[PDB]
Design a protein around this ligand. Sequence first.
Ligand SMILES: CC(C)CCC[C@@H](C)[C@H]1CC[C@H]2[C@@H]3CC=C4C[C@@H](OC(=O)CCC(=O)O)CC[C@]4(C)[C@H]3CC[C@]12C
Ligand SMILES: CC(C)CCC[C@@H](C)[C@H]1CC[C@H]2[C@@H]3CC=C4C[C@@H](OC(=O)CCC(=O)O)CC[C@]4(C)[C@H]3CC[C@]12C
Lengths: 231, 231
Amino acid sequence: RFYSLGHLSIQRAALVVLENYYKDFTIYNPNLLTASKFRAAKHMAGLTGQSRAMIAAAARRRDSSHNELYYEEAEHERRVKKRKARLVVAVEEAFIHIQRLQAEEQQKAPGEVMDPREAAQAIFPSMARALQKYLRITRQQNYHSMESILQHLAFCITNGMTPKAFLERYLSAGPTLQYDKDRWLSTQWRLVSDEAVTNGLRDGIVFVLKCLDFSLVVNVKKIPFIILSEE
Amino acid sequence: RFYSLGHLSIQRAALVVLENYYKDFTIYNPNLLTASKFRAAKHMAGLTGQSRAMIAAAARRRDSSHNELYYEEAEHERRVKKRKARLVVAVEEAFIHIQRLQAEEQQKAPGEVMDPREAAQAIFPSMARALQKYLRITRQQNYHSMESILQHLAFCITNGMTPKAFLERYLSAGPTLQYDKDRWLSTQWRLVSDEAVTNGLRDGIVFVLKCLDFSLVVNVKKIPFIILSEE
Ligand SMILES: CC(C)CCC[C@@H](C)[C@H]1CC[C@H]2[C@@H]3CC=C4C[C@@H](OC(=O)CCC(=O)O)CC[C@]4(C)[C@H]3CC[C@]12C
Ligand SMILES: CC(C)CCC[C@@H](C)[C@H]1CC[C@H]2[C@@H]3CC=C4C[C@@H](OC(=O)CCC(=O)O)CC[C@]4(C)[C@H]3CC[C@]12C
């Protein structure tokens, strides 16, 4: 991500970066890191001009080998698309059932809207299997909890949102602030920089914002002297 | 292949099988055998209830591994189709050039048809690269020789055949008799059978026709007693 700041201290710039991180950066997912580590561990489990020649020959031989990553990525994308379509159909059917239940409850009592909580309770099992399958295939089951899903469904029922709005929240990972408060931690943040944090921003300085299992590297650059002429 | 024979000796049945082999069976291609051996040699290079359990677990783990064969076979089929289309286009252009040359030679002298040999000489380089690429991708370069290709082109010019007829000879492997005489050997054939070859055919007897690098196993069965009734 890129941001524009003024004459500020290193600590102030780090705080601005942190506050923009929640609403800008995608939520951190350790599942991708675990998958990458599992993929990389195979090479470790299997195991200076001459060494350079040998590694160059090994790389050349590998370049002619089978491209295992591409086909499995394509299969994963196809499975994700199929499960997304199934989840969309299930959510549409659930919303149809919600509309039918509201219409039925309309005749029972006029001017007395039903509480959405019981409607969410009755409707959730219909799409529960599809939502769980989509979360499993997208590695998003940890963030989305059953109570959170029920609360979001009730909120959508109160607002009368379209099924697409409900679907898109669980479609892809988004900002940190979308999930619950306990998901993010604002206490373990640390600042690492060779220069003192009391000094102002300078061209070429680089600092790091550390936190549990992940760090953000911030590079500071000076805007070039723009020269404008009337043709 | 399946054939129907009468009361014949083992030698006569083997001779009938051999004479039908040339006009029925596809030409033997050792390139596929070499490819299969190269694929199988990787397992050798890499390397009783407990052993059975271990091999069953290994097979189960392999069943969940990547299907390398399918994607590479699909890529090979796509490449073969693309090269086939390119060869078809090249042969069509070559036949157009042949027709143009014949039309040009018509005005030079009436009633004196040109010899097809020089036309084949002039036309072969146009499609030579495409034909060589197709033979390389189909592992058929050994059987089809340059002189044989020229002779086939001259024969087609004399008969005025369509480009499809010329293409289909090199399209896929066919009968043994299509290629040159030196391709097939009718001297190294041998007969292997536990029973004496002088005896007649009997149900359940099996024999082998051996030849250089390849053998044909022949199984003999008796036609079942068919009972027919008028409803
Ligand atoms: C005759 C009298 C009126 C003279 C008064 C002198 C002031 C104009 C000087 C004396 C002390 C100076 C301050 C001493 C230390 C600091 C901290 C210093 O902090 C930094 O370098 C980090 C912040 C940044 O990046 O600007 C910024 C300048 C400042 C406010 C100075 C601003 C100018 C001050 C007030
Ligand atoms: C009073 C006179 C007229 C009696 C004559 C007797 C013949 C009717 C017999 C005597 C020798 C026999 C032959 C002896 C040996 C052979 C070889 C034998 O060969 C096999 O078993 C392999 C071929 C096959 O599968 O039939 C077949 C029967 C045959 C021709 C026999 C056929 C019947 C023959 C001519």
